Structures are given as structure tokens and as C-alpha cells.
Amino acid sequence: MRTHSLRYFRLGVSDPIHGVPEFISVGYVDSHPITTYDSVTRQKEPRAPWMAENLAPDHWERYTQLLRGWQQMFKVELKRLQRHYNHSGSHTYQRMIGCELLEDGSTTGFLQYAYDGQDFLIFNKDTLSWLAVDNVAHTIKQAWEANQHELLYQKNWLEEECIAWLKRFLEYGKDTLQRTEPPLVRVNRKTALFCKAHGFYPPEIYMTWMKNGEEIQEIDYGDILPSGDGTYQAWASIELDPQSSNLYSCHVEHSGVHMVLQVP
């Protein structure tokens, strides 16, 4: 298999405008939403048909209960951070946990938090410690690191449980997640040369420009963008020298296949 990942995000907001949830939690496998929960529905629900198909009602009922607890825990934690920052008004609290199963069979795992969209605490599961970006985070680090069992529990979860869940979900969604749609690639002239790719899946793609066999620095890279049909598009551009021609060529790498478009 290519590389795959599983991640769960949480978002808490301290003084949300009317109608907006104070808590949201969404799971992803690769770029695909798989699960959602928020403080308005108070239910964990599938976000992919192959999740709904393969997880029985008892799974959604059990995690609904856990998510209601994690929601309350998130509120208490955000309340503590904002009191220690001495901040008024509405602020945000975020969490991300997950793992990657790499093509070569090795794994990674990560757990981190953010306040107002900036890194706050970052777990290191190898040193079993928390990195704190300021002294509010440092206070939390001290409290969390005093409970060494909970650090060991997160290491087990990232290294063993997370990977097992990812493998399970990869099988459920295999017709979506393990497929390949190669890119359609062309060079447009606009003076700049545009390498344009579309219709590809998965979204990971490498595009660059070479000049006379040396990589151009002077490349403008476009974002990988969703087309809306489950495939993606992207572009990369290079500016032409008006005084001297050059051998330009686009290079595209996607899911193990390399492609070259030489501009005549």
C-alpha cells in the first residue's frame, strides 16, 4: 500500500456566536472524513458510506457516549487555559491525534494541541514528554507529566491501537482509499508555462519544472485542490526568459509513475 493515515480532530470555542457548536470532533482517513460529532447533534455519525456499512449501531452508540464526555472535558480544559492566559472573549482550543502507516511498513504517531490556532502542547511518544510553547502550556505539561501512566497509555494508543484502527478502516474503504486515478497533464502558455494536472487520486502529487535538465526556486506552485468528484487538480508555473530559449519540461510524479512533458 501507499502511505495512509488516521486522525481525529477536536475544536472547542469558548463564546461561540449563536447557532455555532461549542464543540466539534471529526475523524479522517487520508483526506476523507469518516466520522463527525458536535455539541448540537450530540451524536457520533459516519461521514463515509463505507463507515456506515461496516460499523454496527453499537459502535456509534458507544462512541457517542465517549464523545459526550470528551466534549465536557474539552470545555473544562479550555476554561482553564483562558483563565490562565487572562483572556476575555471567544477563543479556540484544538486537538489532533493520529498515526501513519507508511508504504515500507513503518509507522508514525502524533498527538498535539493548539490554542487560538497556534501550537500549544506537542507530545513526544519516544521521550514520553510534552513540549510546551509558553508558560501556560508549561503548567499543563507539569500536571500531565506527573501522571506517567497516562503518557504510557497514549504511546500504546498511537503505536498499536491507532494503527489497528487504520488497517481496519483501510479495508472497509479499500475501493475508495486504495484506488489510483492517474493525472491528465498538459502544458498551457499564458509569458509563463503552466503545467496543469487534473482528475487524479490520491491527492499526493509532485509537479516541478526542469530547465535543460536542472531543477528551476523560480517555480510558482499551485495548491492541490478538490475538483468535487473525488479527484484533485493542481498546477505549477515557470516564467519564460524573453531573451533566450531553454529546454523546459514538466515533471509529474504520482502513485509510483513518473511523467515528463517536454515543451517544444
Epitope: 458507544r62 465517549l66 464526555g69 470528551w70 472535558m73 501512566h149 497516562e150 497509555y153 491501537e161
Partner: antibody, heavy 109, light 116 residues
């Protein structure tokens, strides 16, 4: 089906050592607990393991092997007050606690 | 520092009678549980409450129901007592649910005997 197994009863001599085994077959693993329950009383927390290896707490140590699915609770320098039941419990992938039926430990003075 | 406080300690019931067991914890915990303990088997969860304001069935909910009255208190009801409900009932609490290493704190137990 998920299963936790431990012996019904063990008998050892005052002053000696006893190893109480717990083997589990669970859907996922989020930690293993030992509780002590004296006769007629409530279970109280003894130990928690989730990575591999041995952890010491005074006269009691607890060991875990995740790949072999077992734990033991090691009691050294046994005293009459160690007479009790010892309950092991495992958290599965959905964080549900699965409880063993308990091992009653009898100490010979 | 009372910990977990449950009542009654002992109770005799006739088949068909209803009864409520009370449990309070003063540890500012969020999760509460009702277990029954029977000879020869591991503790079985009847109902639990992951946080104030929510509850759900455990492994053996039939014949029982619960109310999480507030953050401190978690009541267990026997709708219509049956001899199979003769058991020792334990209330327990923990700081959270769905964390890893957090242990349970148990009440003293409630011994109930149901007779025809």
C-alpha cells in the same frame, strides 16, 4: 468473543512469593488493571500496565506482555493481610472494562 | 473526603417490588457506574454515565434503569425485583471515561436478596 482468565484460587505460605496470572483475549488493548478485594469489602486499585515490562510498587509488582496477552501480579514477603481476592480487568478498543472472575489468595501462617 | 457513598448496605425484597439504590461521589468525578458482582464471574456493568447529563446501558441492563441526577449522584432502580437480581451491587466513579489509565473508585456495596 472477548475473554479474561485467571485461576479461581491460589494458596501460598506466609513469607513466600506468589504470582497471580491473568490472560486476556480482547478486541484491542488500552491497559490492564489489578484490583484487590478483601472479603466483604469493595475492590481497590492496585496497579496499571499498558506497555511491556515489570513495574514495582513496594511488595507488589505487575508485569505485562502485550504480544502474549498476559499479565501477572507478583506479591512478595506474603503476610496474612494479603489474603483477599485479586481481580484483573482489561480495557478493550472501545474503552470497555472487561473483568476477570478474580483469584482468591489464601495464606498459610 | 468521603469517596463513593452508596445505600442501602443491605436490603430484602419480595419478588415484584421496586427499589432504588443511591450513590454519591464527592471526588468531583465525571463518570459513574453501576456493577453487579456474582459468584464465579467477573463484575458486570449494568448502566453507566460517562459525564453529567448522559447515561447508557452496560452489559446487563434488563430489569434496571438509572438516573444521573447531577454530577455527584447516580441512582439505580430495580423495576420489578426478580430472584435473579439477588446480587451485590457496586457503584463506582472515575475522573473520566475513555481515557486510559484512570482507575475506578468503588462504593461499599449493596447486598440485595430477592425472595418469592
Amino acid at each position: 468473543g472477548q475473554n479474561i482468565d485467571q485461576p479461581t484460587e491460589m494458596t501460598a505460605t506466609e513469607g513466600a512469593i506468589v504470582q497471580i496470572n491473568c490472560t486476556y483475549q480482547t478486541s484491542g488493548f488500552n491497559g490492564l488493571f489489578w484490583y484487590q478485594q478483601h472479603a466483604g469489602e469493595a475492590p481497590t486499585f492496585l496497579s496499571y500496565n499498558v506497555l511491556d515490562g515489570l513495574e514495582e510498587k513496594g511488595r507488589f509488582s505487575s508485569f505485562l506482555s502485550r504480544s502474549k496477552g498476559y499479565s501477572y501480579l507478583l506479591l512478595k514477603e506474603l503476610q496474612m493481610k494479603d489474603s483477599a481476592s485479586y481481580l484483573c480487568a482489561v480495557k478493550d478498543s472501545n474503552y470497555q472494562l472487561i473483568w476477570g472472575a478474580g483469584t482468591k489468595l489464601i495464606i498459610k501462617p | 473526603n468521603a469517596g463513593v457513598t452508596q445505600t442501602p448496605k443491605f436490603q430484602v425484597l419480595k419478588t415484584g417490588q421496586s427499589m432504588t439504590l443511591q450513590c454519591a461521589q464527592d471526588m468531583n468525578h465525571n463518570s459513574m457506574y453501576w456493577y453487579r458482582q456474582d459468584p464465579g464471574m467477573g463484575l458486570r456493568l449494568i448502566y453507566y454515565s460517562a459525564s453529567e447529563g448522559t447515561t447508557d446501558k452496560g452489559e446487563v441492563p434488563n430489569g434496571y434503569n438509572v438516573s444521573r441526577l447531577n454530577k455527584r449522584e447516580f441512582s439505580l432502580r430495580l423495576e420489578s425485583a426478580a430472584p435473579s437480581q439477588t446480587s451485590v451491587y457496586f457503584c463506582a466513579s472515575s475522573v473520566w471515561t475513555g481515557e486510559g489509565s484512570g482507575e475506578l473508585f468503588f462504593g461499599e456495596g449493596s447486598r440485595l436478596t430477592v425472595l418469592e
